[model samples]
Target chain A: EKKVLLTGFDPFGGETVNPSWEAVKRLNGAAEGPASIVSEQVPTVFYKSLAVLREAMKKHQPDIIICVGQAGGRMQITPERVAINLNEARIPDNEGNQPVGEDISQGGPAAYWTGLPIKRIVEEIKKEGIPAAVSYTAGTFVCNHLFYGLMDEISRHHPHIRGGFIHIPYIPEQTLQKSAPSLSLDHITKALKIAAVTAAAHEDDIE
Target chain B: MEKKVLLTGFDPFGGETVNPSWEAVKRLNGAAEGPASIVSEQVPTVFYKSLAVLREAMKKHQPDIIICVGQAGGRMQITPERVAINLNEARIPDNEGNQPVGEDISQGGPAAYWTGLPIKRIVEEIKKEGIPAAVSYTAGTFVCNHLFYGLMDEISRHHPHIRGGFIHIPYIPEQTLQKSAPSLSLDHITKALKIAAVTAAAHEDDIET
Candidate 1:
């Protein structure tokens, strides 16, 4: 009876694949308890990224929204704590626009605390043998831009919809050329499923 | 040896003819104290165009130190802002009729920037002149913050050698006559600007407030 809107970014930064979308798409039509997963692929551009997420939010109107992205060097799955109102791209986005010192939302708050039960979500993932932790900085890239934009919209328009961002390590295939930490696609998918079910199970976070 | 200081103020917005920032800053043009030579420019109350105006002034004058002033009508004291956030959420449309609801000034910029000027030192210098002054935290989300952020961004990205910050002044006497808002004298505001310029040009490090 409950619906979860799961989103992952398209492949970016010259990589042929994004593990976020690869894991998220596999959860489509799957159900955990009362929640059914509806997945969508978000663009890696700036303003257009938020635009696509907004459209998905409108169509699905899910009770829970979990947007995931790839953190190339991180060893564990990280659920972000807060999303700041900034976007400083170290490299150009997929659309070739690189902002140096810019705001994600003009007139928005400086930061937004996540609505998801992050501590509980991490606990659930770790129980399944997938490394997980809470991340403070999502970096001022398109990931944070979307994270901040999502919370801004929820705070302003959709108070009932719970939302947050999660950053997972690169898949094993993405690390074949470079010295990096990664998990198998199966492990990443399991971690996301645990996160979604955990999010659906708890309306309030554990203290 | 003279240090050139370029000071800018915005044109009037919100249905007012006179902007106290321009009135106060223009009086200090060509004025000099110690090693600082003052030059003033009036910036439009528009978003992207304001940064263009600022860049042109910086290119032409090449000031060693820059201080931008804006009007905050109800404020009783002259305040120097400490940080500029990268935001341009206009409460009212600008002079150009562009109202950015939720947009970044730059497509890929940092969240915020610290002022390059010695703000605490500037506040102390202004207060010692018998004018009320303090350090302000928020420069608002209007054109004021837009220009302030733009100034710091430019300095951080290109001109690390220069020092710059933003200061907010209350409305002058005439502008506050029909309302209950507080006002400052044009003379006092002008004197405060002079003190700010001199202190900023002289001090390289900020002191504790």
Candidate 2:
């Protein structure tokens, strides 16, 4: 039996709802063979995101972790390839913090690659006819901050745990006003479920 | 000439249904005390939008002085802020779920701006009415400081003669019912703000504490 943890950030940038949470919530109790998914909502703040994540890891200690975020314009579900150490906001956060050129960690590594089998995850997702790909950059925002922090957490203490970040497109409602690519909430959940299964089944990332 | 006074307060944030700052501001709306006609608006608890709201109100009303109010939940007293710092280090995210840490609010901006209002006298006036009031040195690293800094910056750039500053108020009695924290009555908080508005309009020479 394996425990899978799925994390989604709350709505930000004027959005009333977040698709990541909307999809991730339904993922609870969803299982593939021996793996069961447990989901949680992570706040969209900088240090606060990391703070909550550390707490979740302490509480659940899941074998596989998938952190999700909303990327407004991206057409497909993108599994992030790497998380960089930066916190430069193009706009101010909800608390009005807009950091520029700051390090996510003091005296820490410049980058951390995701431990999940992202290539196989993407291939498995595409096999299900859902659009997805491996993303090279997670952007220098809170998503990147958490992704990098997730890897750093694993590197430091949870060396045996496998985890990575995923970026999802806006839901249909979020794209009603502006022209942006979006997937229905159902498809996003389905993709995540399949990804969880693939992550549990495979230990080593595919080249 | 009836002096125009602009008062702004933040909307409910941090899972609270009501903010004493907004509650107090709304009560003082349409008030005509002293030689002032008070005009008020509720600002979003966001960083950029709050400043935009203040600027719009300032442009529309052309107020002689500005008084911005924000909530300080744990304090038992109404605190008049003396200065606003140029920092955005939030312990929690705003309503929009954005938490900023160690960011300069306004680059090349002054390190801080002292409130143009008679903050010291406002505290004294509040305390005179038996409400616990004091002059606060720190505005915290939240949206309150953001608005305060933005208000001062706007006045310094466009309306040099216009005086403006921020005041932090404690939770109302209703807000404190669930928690053991201190709270003030809504009527008392409203009365204090009205006094502050009148005092800011009438006294150009601040009564130094």
What proportion of the true contacts does each candidate reproduce? 0.00, 0.00
- Window of ten residues with lowest summed lDDT in model 2 chain B: B173-182
lDDT of 1 by residue, B71-102 (tens): 98767677899989878898789999999978
Model 2 TM-score, 2 decimals: 0.50
Off by over 4 Å in 2: A1-207
lDDT of 2 by residue, B1-209 (tens): 56788998889998889888988898778889988789889999987777888888888888998999999877656778988999988888887787888988889899998888888888777767655577889998899999999899888888999989988886664454333344455666788888888888888768877
Q: What are the Cα lDDT values of the candidates?
A: 0.87, 0.84
The CA lDDT at B112 in model 1 is: 87
Interface RMSD for model 1 amounts to 29.0
